[PDB]
A paper describes a structure:
The early secreted Cpn effector protein [name] binds to the inner leaflet of the PM below the invading EB and directly recruits G-actin and the essential endocytic proteins SNX9 and N-WASP12.
To elucidate how [name] functions at the molecular level, we determined the 3D structure of the protein, N-terminally truncated up to and including the APH motif ([name]ΔAPH67-382) at a resolution of 2.1 Å. Owing to its flexibility, the latter is not visible in the electron density. The proline-rich domains (PRD1 and PRD2) are within the IDR and provide a highly flexible interaction surface. We found that [name]ΔAPH is a monomer in solution and the p(r) function indicated a globular core – corresponding to the helical core domain revealed by the X-ray structure – and an elongated tail. Helices α1 and α2 of [name]’s rigid core carry the two predicted WH2 sequences essential for G-actin binding.
Residue numbers in the entry: 11 to 72, 79 to 247
The structure:
Amino acid sequence: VLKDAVHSHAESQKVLKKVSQELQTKWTDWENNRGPDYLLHGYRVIARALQQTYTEQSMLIEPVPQAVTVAKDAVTQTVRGAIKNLENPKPGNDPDGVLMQVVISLGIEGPTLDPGESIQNFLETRVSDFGGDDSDIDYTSDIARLGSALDRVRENHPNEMPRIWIALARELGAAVHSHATSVRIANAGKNHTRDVVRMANESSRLLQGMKVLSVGAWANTMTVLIGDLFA
């Protein structure tokens, strides 16, 4: 390589760990001290990232196999399950957000995953990440249906994946907005929209920089933020 780029890669590795640590210290201070505003800034960042995959994947769109229609049906079914688990649980269960946390991770991170990792492996990894291995609900059939439908499309015709990301991102973005207003109204008298907007802009510029530097590092930091949302 150029000597020059090899030196810049090391400098980038150092900047990357500094930004990750600064993000997590900012978020721990904000969650600790700024209460509900922290959660609302979280939803704002998540909504922005979903809008990002919505627009970028919309740019990529240039007969369409049945596997695509099956994948679209699997994402609506699974997102429905995620929201039901979170906001209208069965009699005898408590609200559970991990399925929502994993499908949001998929909407945000899925388009930039390495081809070598299957969607099914991604989903299982993030169920583990969000503490879902010790839970009350079985996510097995939900994540199975999503993972198999999406991996069928990703193996047979990856160039068709945008149609799925688009539909996933759009629906999730709407669900986030609806849910954010519920949290916001629940905290009437304590909301500071100026601080939410500022916090969301700081977080987003640091996360976007991190994403250009290392998509896996960005995805792990995003996992931390998403873990604080959806109860």
